[PDB]
Symmetry: D3
Amino acid sequence: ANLLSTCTSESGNIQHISPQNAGWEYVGFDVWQLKAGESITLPSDERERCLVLVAGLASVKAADSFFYRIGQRMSPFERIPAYSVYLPHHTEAKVTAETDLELAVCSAPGFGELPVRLISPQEVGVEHRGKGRNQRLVHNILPDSQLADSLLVVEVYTNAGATSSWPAHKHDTAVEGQETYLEETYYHRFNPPQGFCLQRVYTDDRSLDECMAVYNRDVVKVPKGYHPVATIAGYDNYYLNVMAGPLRKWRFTWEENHAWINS
Amino acid sequence: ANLLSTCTSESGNIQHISPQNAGWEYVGFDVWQLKAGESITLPSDERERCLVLVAGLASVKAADSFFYRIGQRMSPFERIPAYSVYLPHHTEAKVTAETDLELAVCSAPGFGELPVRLISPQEVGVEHRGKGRNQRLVHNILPDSQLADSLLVVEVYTNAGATSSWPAHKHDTAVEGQETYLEETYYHRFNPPQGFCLQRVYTDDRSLDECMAVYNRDVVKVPKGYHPVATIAGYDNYYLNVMAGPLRKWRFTWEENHAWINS
Amino acid sequence: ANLLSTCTSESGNIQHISPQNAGWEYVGFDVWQLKAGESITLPSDERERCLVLVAGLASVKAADSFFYRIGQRMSPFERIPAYSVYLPHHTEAKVTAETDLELAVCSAPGFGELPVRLISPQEVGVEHRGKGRNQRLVHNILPDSQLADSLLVVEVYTNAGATSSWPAHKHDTAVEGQETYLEETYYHRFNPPQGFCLQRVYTDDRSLDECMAVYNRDVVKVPKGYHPVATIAGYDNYYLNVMAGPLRKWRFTWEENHAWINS
Amino acid sequence: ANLLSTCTSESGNIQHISPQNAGWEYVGFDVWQLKAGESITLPSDERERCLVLVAGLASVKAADSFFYRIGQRMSPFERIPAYSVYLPHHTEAKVTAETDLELAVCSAPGFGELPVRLISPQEVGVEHRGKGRNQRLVHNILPDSQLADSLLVVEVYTNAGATSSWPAHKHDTAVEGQETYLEETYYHRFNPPQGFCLQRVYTDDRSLDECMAVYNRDVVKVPKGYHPVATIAGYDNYYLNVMAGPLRKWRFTWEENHAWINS
Amino acid sequence: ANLLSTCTSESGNIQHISPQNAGWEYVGFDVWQLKAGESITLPSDERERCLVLVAGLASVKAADSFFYRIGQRMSPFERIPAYSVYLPHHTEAKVTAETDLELAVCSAPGFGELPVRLISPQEVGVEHRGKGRNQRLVHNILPDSQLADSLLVVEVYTNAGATSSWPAHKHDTAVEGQETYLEETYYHRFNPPQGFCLQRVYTDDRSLDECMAVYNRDVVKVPKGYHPVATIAGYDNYYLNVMAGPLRKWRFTWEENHAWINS
Amino acid sequence: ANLLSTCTSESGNIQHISPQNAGWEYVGFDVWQLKAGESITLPSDERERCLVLVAGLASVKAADSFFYRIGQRMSPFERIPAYSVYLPHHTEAKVTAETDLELAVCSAPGFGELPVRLISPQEVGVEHRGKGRNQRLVHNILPDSQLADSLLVVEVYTNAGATSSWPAHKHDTAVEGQETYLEETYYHRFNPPQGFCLQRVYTDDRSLDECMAVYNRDVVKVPKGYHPVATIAGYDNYYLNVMAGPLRKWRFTWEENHAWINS
Ligand SMILES: [Cl-]
Ligand SMILES: [Cl-]
Ligand SMILES: [Cl-]
Ligand SMILES: [Cl-]
Ligand SMILES: [Cl-]
Ligand SMILES: [Cl-]
Ligand SMILES: [Cl-]
Ligand SMILES: [Cl-]
Ligand SMILES: [Cl-]
Ligand SMILES: [Cl-]
Ligand SMILES: [Cl-]
Ligand SMILES: [Cl-]
Ligand SMILES: [Cl-]
Ligand SMILES: [Cl-]
Ligand SMILES: [Cl-]
Ligand SMILES: [Cl-]
Ligand SMILES: [Cl-]
Ligand SMILES: [Cl-]
Ligand SMILES: [Cl-]
Ligand SMILES: [Cl-]
Ligand SMILES: [Cl-]
Ligand code: NI
Ligand code: NI
Ligand code: NI
Ligand code: NI
Ligand code: NI
Ligand code: NI
Ligand code: NI
Ligand code: NI
Ligand code: NI
Ligand code: NI
Ligand code: NI
Ligand code: NI
């Protein structure tokens, strides 16, 4: 299975993951690397979006509003929450780079009537998950406790020598009250930039079992199974995750052999 | 090519095959394993459906009707026809498990105006196909001689030591008066339950040639080519098949090397 | 990655490439091999089409018109431009084979209001590209300088011992003013007919690097990367290409190591 | 894994399996298809051999012995035991085809001082193994109860439909008093000749799990795991097996899930 | 590539890696899991050996020497050096399990005239390599500064989270004064036992790039390239390595991008 | 299959192909990239060798012979024959680089008593094979009409565009008077150096069918089948081939479909 998508270029639409090229039904994930002064226009269509400023400042025109010079961090490694913008479906938007800009466009099916809204770093829930070699900084950009039709968005910091997305969990089957089907994308970053991590996507029966050396700005698709991330000594890791499915609830099942790591 | 889809769980939506994850255009196939008292709701959308009760009893609310305790067999290995329900498109339906229930939801594009209808075991055409090591019990749940927009549904019993879907046939190309393009899914069952069969999906030129060890509740996708099933001594086999394409007619071509087995 | 699609049959719809089975978003490509007197009907839908007569004569009924015995060449190897027909979306059309007919149906998303139009061999721009072992005859059936919503269509002749689609170029990423995302299909032909060529689809990082022995009437899909064609001594090559993407402009980037071959 | 070796030609040394090309330590297997009057010379080396006359008549000169026009069956499908000649190591041999000849040369390490000997039909143990979809005819050409340094040779007849090398067994690990490491080759034949069977080689953890479609005169290598053969309606099967390892004792372990098929 | 070898059984010769099955020239690695009172005999041949008592107590008879009840640790996770016995070539040896025993037999070509010798904990060099997420305990059982014809043997302890065989190094090419060709095996163990690590074997050009999920008692073969081990939170790792080549000198090259981690 | 071996380094033993790592029985091929003043020593063993000076000057000491500063061309692309030295088995040799040196060591089993000899340009048969897109320069360094126990060595120059090892031939089966089994290695070079060619290794049944993109100093292994080389406009190609088998005679069979290209 080919779950790894390496960047296609250095500038422009460096990552383009769609339901059509991912072989799935809900999640889309795009990254644009723009120079100061450049713009993109997002269309009025049947998809809701979450614009995540990974690095740099931007101005956004949408609905009847103008949002000027949103963003703050110049690197995701500043460890301060991303500035994001929620766009409902049927919303054309123009995004202009105020500085050089690394922009994530998270997409999923849209059908509701929520308004355009800003998700500033102060609206992002911050949590420190796990203990020891399992410690991670989590920024809940768009959790299931906040409003959206489909999208669930999170960014996670895993320092070199820690394991994250671990103990192994899956969200690949609708099992009422236990688990939901949620497609998931990982957009990875490293500090220093030449680093890599090892991500493994696997099922209990191992019918799917793929390990991948993931480098800076690579995407990993998670269509099913467990999906832990093992970082490498010397290279701090960051990832931006998008999830969506038929039911917007994060319900997962832990792999039974490793569930004791939560105790 | 990955044509085999093993069950993702023991309960809930254990099989979910869609045009999007199958890499094709028409056929969808879902299996739900429900405990007595649990329900699912099927949406009003652009897909027609055939609900097939593989094992157990169910109640269905659809259109202006209530169908109570439909089904009979508690195992597909009773060798009595499944109870099924035809749902046209734009038909919301609620299915409640009266007993523990193994429910197949067969789907394809819907566009007509046929009514909701019951397909009881007495409406299922029963035929005994082949002679010797080629003998099989066939239950024509929804054949091309019965009404539906797209769906063709059949279940077949192949006793241990027989070959079925054989002599090799294909339905992967529109060839006027000879063959139709029909995507096909296989949902396999074994008695005793720990068994397997060997299914081979292959083209004449062998550009596609994949053999698979298929276990209990596994799905095989047939996007093209010949697709025979070789059963194993000691393990009786059952499969539930769904087909659909642009033209709802079962027209196939026999592999010429093995066509003499029909003589 | 499986980028090669060999013919499924000798007659009827011998090639059927869709966004759904290609794992992409825009381009569809069909070939029909029809005997004199046979017909097909193309539907009124949301796709625009370019009918390309690869070999043989046809009559077309579309919109309020009847086009009788269009075509001329009985083989693509006559090296005279194909006769083609542009069909906008929402246009049902009936195509009848006047002689035995090899018909290419090129498709992409349609949304405009252009009329049905004939593209006769006299409307096709003819150019001789390259020098020496890089020489090729190019027929611009439907270039970006002519009108269509999405479709770009070209046919190219590469004589045995020449390389084409070379120096290596890619059109797989939206990079403003430099490159566009364009899915591309290749439909290959050989003279004598038992020949083959070697086509390689690869990225700069080699995460994708697939070489393929392509035979008569085979299709190669190009979802991303560089995609040169190396012909074989004794076997002249022909290919028919279809491209489409979000922006109908042919903008590509040359692989830097081989760009000097243009000098 | 690559366990299937198809014939490289119709005449001469059509099968050549060596420890060097098999990725293992002991077993060699060669097939020679000779016309009446042709000969081959086997060298004096460190390997013992068992020359199996699969079909046709041959004369064999080795050491102080000459065997004139030995053989009987003109096809393995006569279901009568083969003639064979055991050759110790350091024994040059000349084999002359008296009729058209299909000759199997089974080889393994030699170190002893056994004499050259004929293994006529009268020295072959004939047995019927299993009941029903499991009943095969077995010819023990060179069992562990007869003399050789390393070689174990058997031929088996599996009628169309039936499963052989079943219930699944393995002989891939030295487990004192339970199992021995024995490399194994299968040389397959079909009646009628255009047939195939499905052979699956797999381990308990499925780290190796390969199913292959086996045609006439193909060889399957079994370096480890379970290795059952599933035959296809209409096509009777035959195979000639060679085994060897560090300990010349046929000790195997049954896969636990299917062991009940022996009771 | 197929670099992972999982255990073939729970008892007996659970690991058997040979130059013939590894696709290389020097290194052999065997593991024997024996019950108290069981024995094995190692042959007199052209290979030298290093018998490593991974866990448990053993007696060893070889040439004019008898070692009674050597060993100490009942688990490799006691973090105390193993007892080992060096055997020159042409030296038959009998190993008797005094307790349940996990025995590693490390082999390589032998040509010299060194005597049989005990390598007790007092002859094992103990060192701590690296700082933080990089700090491992290393036991030099048989380094290049001690006597053997070919064999180099080391065991390493990597605590959960940490990265070992890192910064990435290779020893796959004879480069005078810089690097030697050395085949390498890894025999992995976990505490608790149900754990895994992720090991990646890769070259600078990524022509080889394999990441594998390694479980308890699995073997990884390193025929060339970089080969770091990434451990997982909760699961401590241990591995026993064997190396050999034409020149018995441990000379390696660091991957240039990660060499800074040594400063 | 894995038939391509890319260089492991820029200096030293950049190519090391052995029967053990190639999965075959006879051919060994090594390349050494040495700086002026460096030396290597070839051992006294059971292999005969042909030392080919691909580029640069070398002195060779072997048995009672010393060859001082032999060689001439500083690049294979000078299109003048190489100097080579034939070494029988049991012959230790010292090779000193007099200038920077690219040295090929071709090896195969040795058993005879031929003397050490120089193969100077005057002993190399020069021939031009084929017409047009098929015309190559061939240097028969060590043909079957010259003396050696096993080795067959040739170098071929294929100008950009042209196809070589074409029409397709195979030498993979002993067929008396028609074909011999001969393993074959290709050591490729390009001018300019950043180029590539496409080489396809395939059998008549396509059970093996591998096309690879070959770059400067890469090696392709041909264990069986047809093996043509398709060059790319702008990049001239060179390759040095080594062959050996049980019978030192170059006998091949042409693929029937392309045999007409010889007329
Ligand atoms: Cl949309
Ligand atoms: Cl996490
Ligand atoms: Cl739920
Ligand atoms: Cl729908
Ligand atoms: Cl059937
Ligand atoms: Cl029809
Ligand atoms: Cl449409
Ligand atoms: Cl071109
Ligand atoms: Cl642009
Ligand atoms: Cl005798
Ligand atoms: Cl007789
Ligand atoms: Cl059997
Ligand atoms: Cl035993
Ligand atoms: Cl001693
Ligand atoms: Cl002691
Ligand atoms: Cl280390
Ligand atoms: Cl050195
Ligand atoms: Cl001499
Ligand atoms: Cl000279
Ligand atoms: Cl040639
Ligand atoms: Cl010959
Ligand atoms: Ni709406
Ligand atoms: Ni997740
Ligand atoms: Ni409707
Ligand atoms: Ni079918
Ligand atoms: Ni419209
Ligand atoms: Ni292109
Ligand atoms: Ni002897
Ligand atoms: Ni066996
Ligand atoms: Ni000795
Ligand atoms: Ni190492
Ligand atoms: Ni000798
Ligand atoms: Ni050749």
